[PDB]
Design an enzyme around this catalytic site. Structure first.
Site, PDB file in Angstrom:
ATOM      1  N   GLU A   1       0.321  -1.114   0.168  1.00 40.55           N
ATOM      2  CA  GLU A   1      -0.176  -0.127   0.177  1.00 40.55           C
ATOM      3  C   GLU A   1       0.800   1.699  -0.149  1.00 40.55           C
ATOM      4  O   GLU A   1       1.760   1.503   0.556  1.00 40.55           O
ATOM      5  CB  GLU A   1      -0.842   0.121   1.297  1.00 40.55           C
ATOM      6  CG  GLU A   1      -2.278   1.184   0.563  1.00 40.55           C
ATOM      7  CD  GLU A   1      -2.717   1.181   2.719  1.00 40.55           C
ATOM      8  OE1 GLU A   1      -2.901  -0.006   3.259  1.00 40.55           O
ATOM      9  OE2 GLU A   1      -3.613   2.017   2.260  1.00 40.55           O
TER      10      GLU A   1
ATOM     11  N   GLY B   1       2.665   1.972  11.737  1.00 45.19           N
ATOM     12  CA  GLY B   1       2.569   1.570  12.531  1.00 45.19           C
ATOM     13  C   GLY B   1       1.903  -0.458  12.310  1.00 45.19           C
ATOM     14  O   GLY B   1       2.950  -1.551  12.847  1.00 45.19           O
ATOM     15  N   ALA B   2       1.621  -0.306  10.944  1.00 45.52           N
ATOM     16  CA  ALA B   2       0.909  -2.087  10.330  1.00 45.52           C
ATOM     17  C   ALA B   2      -0.206  -1.888   8.897  1.00 45.52           C
ATOM     18  O   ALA B   2      -0.171  -1.016   8.745  1.00 45.52           O
ATOM     19  CB  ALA B   2       0.366  -3.137  11.594  1.00 45.52           C
TER      20      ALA B   2
ATOM     21  N   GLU C   1     -10.426   3.771   5.812  1.00 44.84           N
ATOM     22  CA  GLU C   1      -9.391   4.418   7.117  1.00 44.84           C
ATOM     23  C   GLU C   1     -10.496   4.713   8.133  1.00 44.84           C
ATOM     24  O   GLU C   1     -10.106   4.461   9.085  1.00 44.84           O
ATOM     25  CB  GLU C   1      -8.022   4.816   6.723  1.00 44.84           C
ATOM     26  CG  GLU C   1      -7.229   4.541   5.874  1.00 44.84           C
ATOM     27  CD  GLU C   1      -6.571   3.216   6.137  1.00 44.84           C
ATOM     28  OE1 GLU C   1      -6.889   3.297   7.913  1.00 44.84           O
ATOM     29  OE2 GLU C   1      -6.093   2.071   5.423  1.00 44.84           O
TER      30      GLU C   1
ATOM     31  N   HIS D   1     -10.329  -4.128   8.999  1.00 44.74           N
ATOM     32  CA  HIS D   1      -9.882  -3.621   7.809  1.00 44.74           C
ATOM     33  C   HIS D   1     -10.574  -4.618   6.820  1.00 44.74           C
ATOM     34  O   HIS D   1     -10.350  -5.045   6.063  1.00 44.74           O
ATOM     35  CB  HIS D   1      -8.196  -4.198   7.362  1.00 44.74           C
ATOM     36  CG  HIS D   1      -8.894  -2.439   7.003  1.00 44.74           C
ATOM     37  ND1 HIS D   1      -8.861  -0.984   6.601  1.00 44.74           N
ATOM     38  CD2 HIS D   1      -6.898  -1.533   8.058  1.00 44.74           C
ATOM     39  CE1 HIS D   1      -8.198  -0.376   7.212  1.00 44.74           C
ATOM     40  NE2 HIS D   1      -7.213  -0.082   7.801  1.00 44.74           N
TER      41      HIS D   1
ATOM     42  N   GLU E   1      -5.965  -3.243  12.673  1.00 48.74           N
ATOM     43  CA  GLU E   1      -5.983  -4.213  10.677  1.00 48.74           C
ATOM     44  C   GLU E   1      -6.376  -5.234  11.240  1.00 48.74           C
ATOM     45  O   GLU E   1      -6.908  -5.882   9.830  1.00 48.74           O
ATOM     46  CB  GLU E   1      -4.542  -4.474  11.121  1.00 48.74           C
ATOM     47  CG  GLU E   1      -3.579  -4.177  11.322  1.00 48.74           C
ATOM     48  CD  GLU E   1      -3.471  -2.941  10.488  1.00 48.74           C
ATOM     49  OE1 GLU E   1      -4.169  -2.933   9.495  1.00 48.74           O
ATOM     50  OE2 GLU E   1      -3.320  -1.864  10.949  1.00 48.74           O
TER      51      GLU E   1
ATOM     52  N   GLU F   1      -2.827  -4.732   6.832  1.00 50.30           N
ATOM     53  CA  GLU F   1      -3.636  -5.188   6.715  1.00 50.30           C
ATOM     54  C   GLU F   1      -3.543  -6.079   5.646  1.00 50.30           C
ATOM     55  O   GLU F   1      -4.651  -6.869   5.547  1.00 50.30           O
ATOM     56  CB  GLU F   1      -5.200  -4.253   6.975  1.00 50.30           C
ATOM     57  CG  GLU F   1      -5.815  -3.653   5.410  1.00 50.30           C
ATOM     58  CD  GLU F   1      -5.216  -2.103   4.970  1.00 50.30           C
ATOM     59  OE1 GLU F   1      -4.744  -1.628   5.959  1.00 50.30           O
ATOM     60  OE2 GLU F   1      -6.091  -1.132   4.463  1.00 50.30           O
TER      61      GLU F   1
HETATM   62  O1  LIG Z   1      -0.316   1.805  11.298  1.00 53.56           O
HETATM   63  C1  LIG Z   1      -0.921   3.244  10.639  1.00 53.56           C
HETATM   64  N1  LIG Z   1      -1.888   2.957   9.471  1.00 53.56           N
HETATM   65  C2  LIG Z   1      -1.874   2.391   8.445  1.00 53.56           C
HETATM   66  C3  LIG Z   1      -2.763   1.613   8.667  1.00 53.56           C
HETATM   67  O2  LIG Z   1      -3.746   2.236   7.775  1.00 53.56           O
HETATM   68  N2  LIG Z   1      -3.338   0.120   8.899  1.00 53.56           N
HETATM   69  O3  LIG Z   1      -4.236  -0.277   8.417  1.00 53.56           O
HETATM   70  C4  LIG Z   1      -1.483   2.699   7.379  1.00 53.56           C
HETATM   71  C5  LIG Z   1      -0.275   3.969   7.245  1.00 53.56           C
HETATM   72  C6  LIG Z   1       0.145   4.232   6.175  1.00 53.56           C
HETATM   73  C7  LIG Z   1       0.334   3.018   5.093  1.00 53.56           C
HETATM   74  C8  LIG Z   1       1.729   3.117   4.156  1.00 53.56           C
HETATM   75  C9  LIG Z   1       0.786   4.160   3.125  1.00 53.56           C
HETATM   76  C10 LIG Z   1       2.105   3.944   1.884  1.00 53.56           C
HETATM   77  F1  LIG Z   1       1.863   5.070   0.425  1.00 53.56           F
HETATM   78  C11 LIG Z   1       3.466   3.699   1.695  1.00 53.56           C
HETATM   79  F2  LIG Z   1       3.924   4.052   0.615  1.00 53.56           F
HETATM   80  C12 LIG Z   1       3.660   2.822   2.925  1.00 53.56           C
HETATM   81  F3  LIG Z   1       4.675   2.820   3.258  1.00 53.56           F
HETATM   82  C13 LIG Z   1       3.021   3.042   3.910  1.00 53.56           C
HETATM   83  C14 LIG Z   1       0.139   1.977   5.563  1.00 53.56           C
HETATM   84  C15 LIG Z   1      -0.503   1.429   6.579  1.00 53.56           C
HETATM   85  C16 LIG Z   1      -1.529   3.980  11.711  1.00 53.56           C
HETATM   86  C17 LIG Z   1      -1.805   2.777  13.356  1.00 53.56           C
HETATM   87  C18 LIG Z   1      -2.935   2.622  12.816  1.00 53.56           C
HETATM   88  C19 LIG Z   1      -3.999   3.179  12.211  1.00 53.56           C
HETATM   89  C20 LIG Z   1      -3.304   4.175  11.847  1.00 53.56           C
HETATM   90 ZN   LIG Z   2      -5.485   1.248   8.183  1.00 56.20          ZN
END
Ligand SMILES: O=C(N[C@@H](C(=O)NO)c1ccc(-c2cc(F)c(F)c(F)c2)cc1)C1CCCC1
Ligand SMILES: [Zn+2]
Ligand SMILES: [Mg+2]
Ligand SMILES: [Mg+2]
Ligand SMILES: [Mg+2]
Ligand SMILES: [Mg+2]
Length: 889
Positions: free
Chosen positions: A124, A265-266, A324, A305, A302, A268
């Site tokens: 992602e 952070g993580a 999100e 999701h 996660e 899905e």
């Molecule tokens: O971890 C979180 N957010 C995650 C997330 O929504 N997880 O569901 C999340 C953010 C950015 C990306 C992301 C995008 C890009 F464009 C990239 F290049 C990349 F390397 C990585 C991947 C995952 C915080 C803590 C819990 C929710 C908010």
């Molecule tokens: Zn997320």
């Protein structure tokens, strides 16, 4: 720079039905072979076939097993592979390629990369194109058949999405595994992991179908003893989706994997969720208390999701908030239910009104569904996530739990297995709205403005009471300031959860009531109101707005003591503090500007201090709530209320207010610090990783907050308490002992002691770095240089870099040193980091987001550093785009 526009969405002229991958990991390179079974879509107009593919080295490409030749049939420019339309078939065809990639040197942590000794992907948003050629957008849904091969000794555990259908030996000490994932998915949900991983596992039986689901949590061997809490959180997440939403997991297995190097952070990825180790791993000996809520939140996020993002996915990236915002809202409902503490909701509001409100009044302000983007890596903002979550939560407030659940199930049932848009969710909520209102003519068309309109609304009030008529009125007005996205702002559908408190007995005067403000202004009248009430407004923080309650401090004190709603109590306290801060700030500012030899400061309201004492001394009151009332509002919250903010004057203002309150309450603080010890530090369950007590952690938060206040105050002999606190088994306590010792000559003694306690656990050492970074030290710049030379060095681990630098940027007095040396330091770190990780470089720009809100000298100093960064010849696309927007270029 290519700008993508939301209104330009068009389905592709092509279809990808099946992906068959062979990923062969070798010592110095990884070879990726991929066959795409493709077709021509109804939207095709005979165009060239253009694949995304970034940084791939082509070994060969073919169509229907006929090798294509560069220049004649295709071109590749390191970003796009173009196959000229005359060579593209008119019916179903196979495209195949073999490329070479290099995870070992992929320090940007996107695509396929190496984190310590683990090979891991992050796709992602548009990272799959860094692994192989694809039409890399979420509406290109396909089946995946994935084989991974690797040296068996170095990489004994191989994982991808779907079912593991074969495992096999390969000559030369290699082995392979094949994973088939029949359900359609977008490519951003693909993942692969290879490593010497250890695990904990469990079996979960679903509530209705009674399906057995295997749960596995993985880490490197060194930290396998830190996996227990994550597994418990996953079980809790599955049960909550079953219990609240009636939703069960659909697959035979779910894997969670911790890696040390991660941008966020993580993630899905379907059946294979990948985590920053700091958001999966904890133990009571080696983690601060915050890790427990963090893991609960992120594991839950996660997992949720799987429905909101995975089973129902996105048509395009402009819909990001649909997955999100909605998943954050689901995680918030979950965490509120699991912790059973009012501070869970308050902590989310505290973050929104500081960090997100700042963003929304900055040059970066955007709606939760932006109209355009250049960098997807810059799209993952607190606006999209946290304001998105509040927009998703307002539907629950408007509908109530029963009709909200009905509307959510409509959304899931209609869109399961498909892509979706924000309109699809609003449509489902609208169907429930019509049912609740018993009116097929009711609609939520106005509600869509929450997706398109940027900026924070301001909601203000006036009141009127007629004692003869027993009639009370609340007149309400809403206003959003014009900005770059809308010159004219329209009124929003704002739900205002309200109560009316009888000031004589503290009791509720009306039943639960949610005012639906849909106009620029409205007057809400209540009959049979026997006495003039004090209104309790925006209970639970019912809309993401600036609340102007127009109450006196006497009325706010009454709510703080006697209201039933935690948020309104917390907000009434916040508003008392803000009125004091703004008054004293202006008094100090005038004395500075006029170079006064003497002047007066308005004291803190004595009845407010008495109210704090009353709550602190109430043994039935909540320890977490108490910690909020003794803390001034966050600097980033305060700054939204002051033009040309002089950070030194603000620091003096906070110091005066804290000293005023401490001069009255320090003996209370000390008595509570001592009396809370037994319950706060109870070790009964220290060696049980399944037993997590959120109330007890809040008692520790309160003790550590009080200890900080008493240390800054130089309370008599408090250093004795600090030294004893450093001997506590809980890292939250012993790290607190380091930070509060900053005011004493024992600081470097505790620095060394806590370093030795932290150095052998990677995540604990990062928490130690954060503690040093945010220490209130006059020599902080010299300390940071010591961390650089002795601990951080040239690490490319984002957790290391963020830990060293971000806490320091919140040091109001030192980061904002009038020489500009703090701005220069962080800009140097940003430019250095941008060479290898542009996404993290942009995260490190965070302190600059408020640049145009500071005093004119600091504005100039920050702008100079941003212009210096913008002039770097090797600046990344991410950082350039971000700084151009932030500086209004
Ligand atoms: O971890 C979180 N957010 C995650 C997330 O929504 N997880 O569901 C999340 C953010 C950015 C990306 C992301 C995008 C890009 F464009 C990239 F290049 C990349 F390397 C990585 C991947 C995952 C915080 C803590 C819990 C929710 C908010
Ligand atoms: Zn997320
Ligand atoms: Mg390459
Ligand atoms: Mg159950
Ligand atoms: Mg390391
Ligand atoms: Mg601008």
């Amino acid at each position: 720079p290519k700008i993508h526009y939301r209104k330009d969405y068009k389905p592709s002229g092509f279809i990808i039905n099946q992906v068959t991958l062979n990923i062969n990991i070798h010592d110095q390179e990884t070879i990726v072979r991929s066959v795409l079974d493709m077709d021509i879509s109804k939207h095709n107009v005979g165009e060239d076939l253009v694949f995304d593919g970034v940084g791939l080295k082509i070994n060969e490409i073919s169509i229907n097993n006929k090798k294509l030749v560069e220049g004649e049939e295709y071109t590749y420019d390191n970003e796009f592979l173009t196959i000229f339309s005359k060579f593209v078939p008119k019916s179903k065809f196979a495209f195949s390629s073999e490329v070479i990639i290099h995870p070992e040197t992929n320090y940007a942590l996107t695509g396929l990369y190496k984190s310590k000794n683990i090979i891991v992907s992050q796709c992602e948003a548009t990272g799959f194109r860094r692994i192989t050629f694809f039409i890399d957008r979420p509406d290109m849904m396909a089946k995946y058949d994935v084989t991974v091969t690797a040296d068996k000794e170095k990489y004994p555990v191989l994982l991808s999405n779907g079912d593991k259908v074969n495992e096999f030996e390969i000559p030369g000490g290699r082995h392979g595994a094949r994973f088939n994932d029949p359900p359609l998915k977008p490519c951003y949900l693909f993942a692969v992991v290879a490593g010497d991983l250890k695990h904990l596992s469990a079996t979960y039986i679903t509530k209705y179908t009674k399906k057995k689901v295997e749960l596995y949590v993985f880490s490197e061997e060194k930290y396998v003893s830190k996996l227990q809490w994550a597994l418990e959180c996953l079980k809790k997440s599955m049960a909550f989706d079953e219990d609240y939403f009636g939703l069960e997991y659909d697959l035979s297995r779910l894997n969670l994997v911790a890696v040390s190097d991660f941008n966020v952070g993580a993630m899905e990825n379907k059946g294979l969720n990948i985590f920053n180790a700091n958001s999966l791993l904890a133990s009571k000996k080696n983690s601060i208390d915050f890790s427990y809520a963090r893991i609960l939140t992120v594991v839950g996020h996660e997992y949720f999701h799987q429905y909101t993002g995975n089973r129902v996915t996105l048509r395009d990236w402009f819909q990001l908030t649909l997955k999100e915002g909605l998943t954050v809202h689901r995680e918030n409902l979950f965490s509120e239910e699991m912790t059973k503490t009012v501070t869970t909701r308050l902590s989310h509001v505290d973050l929104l009104r500081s960090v997100q409100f700042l963003e929304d009044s900055s040059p970066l302000s955007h709606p939760i569904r932006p109209e355009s983007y250049v960098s997807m890596e810059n799209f993952y903002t607190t606006t999209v996530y946290d304001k998105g979550s509040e927009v998703m939560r307002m539907y629950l407030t408007i509908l109530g739990e029963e009709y909200y659940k009905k509307g959510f199930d409509i959304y899931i049932k209609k869109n399961d297995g498909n892509t979706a848009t924000c309109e699809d969710f609003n449509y489902a909520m609208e169907q429930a709205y019509k049912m609740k209102k018993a009116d097929n003519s009711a609609n939520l068309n106005q509600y869509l403005l929450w997706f398109s309109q940027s900026g924070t609304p301001h909601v203000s009030f006036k009141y009127n009471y007629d004692a003869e008529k027993k009639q009370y009125s609340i007149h309400v007005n809403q206003y959003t300031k014009p900005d770059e996205n809308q010159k004219e702002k329209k009124p929003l559908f704002i739900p205002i959860s309200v109560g009316l408190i009888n000031p004589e007995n503290g009791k509720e005067m009306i039943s639960q009531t949610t005012l639906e403000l849909t106009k620029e202004s409205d007057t809400f009248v209540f009959n049979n109101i026997a006495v003039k009430p004090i209104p309790s407004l925006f209970r639970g923080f019912s809309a993401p707005v600036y609340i102007e309650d127009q109450l006196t401090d006497e009325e706010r004190i009454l709510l703080l003591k006697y209201d039933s709603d935690a948020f309104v109590r917390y907000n009434s306290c916040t508003n008392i503090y803000m009125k004091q801060i703004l008054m004293n700030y202006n008094e100090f500012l005038k004395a500075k500007n006029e170079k006064l030899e003497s002047f007066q400061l308005t004291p803190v309201n004595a009845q407010f201090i008495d109210a704090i004492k009353y709550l602190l001394e109430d043994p039935h009151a909540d320890a977490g709530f108490k910690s909020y009332i003794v803390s001034l509002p966050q600097d980033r919250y305060i700054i939204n209320f002051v033009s040309n903010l002089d950070t030194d004057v603000l620091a003096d203002t906070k110091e005066y207010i804290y000293k005023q309150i401490g001069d009255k309450l320090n003996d209370v603080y000390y008595k509570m610090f001592k009396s809370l010890e037994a319950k706060a530090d109870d070790l009964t369950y220290f060696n049980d990783e399944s037993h997590v007590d959120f109330d007890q952690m809040n008692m520790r938060t309160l003790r550590n907050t009080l200890l900080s206040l008493l240390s800054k105050a130089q309370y008599p002999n408090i250093l004795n308490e600090i030294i004893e606190h450093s001997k506590s088994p809980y890292p939250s306590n012993w790290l607190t002992s380091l930070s509060v010792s900053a005011y004493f000559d024992k600081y470097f003694e505790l620095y060394d002691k806590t370093y030795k306690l932290s150095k052998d656990d990677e995540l604990l050492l990062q928490e130690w770095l954060k503690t040093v970074s945010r220490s209130d030290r006059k020599d902080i710049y010299e300390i940071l240089k010591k961390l650089e030379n002795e601990v951080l060095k040239d690490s490319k681990n984002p957790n290391d870099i963020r830990a060293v630098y971000l806490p320091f940027t919140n040091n109001l007095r030192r980061f904002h040193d009038i020489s500009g040396k703090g701005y220069k330091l962080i800009a140097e770190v940003i430019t250095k980091t941008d060479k290898f990780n542009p996404m993290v470089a942009t995260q490190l720009c965070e302190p600059f987001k408020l640049w145009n809100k500071l005093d004119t000298k600091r504005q100039e100093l920050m702008l100079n550093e941003m212009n210096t960064m913008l002039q770097e010849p090797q600046i990344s696309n991410n950082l350039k785009e971000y700084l151009l927007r932030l500086t209004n270029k």
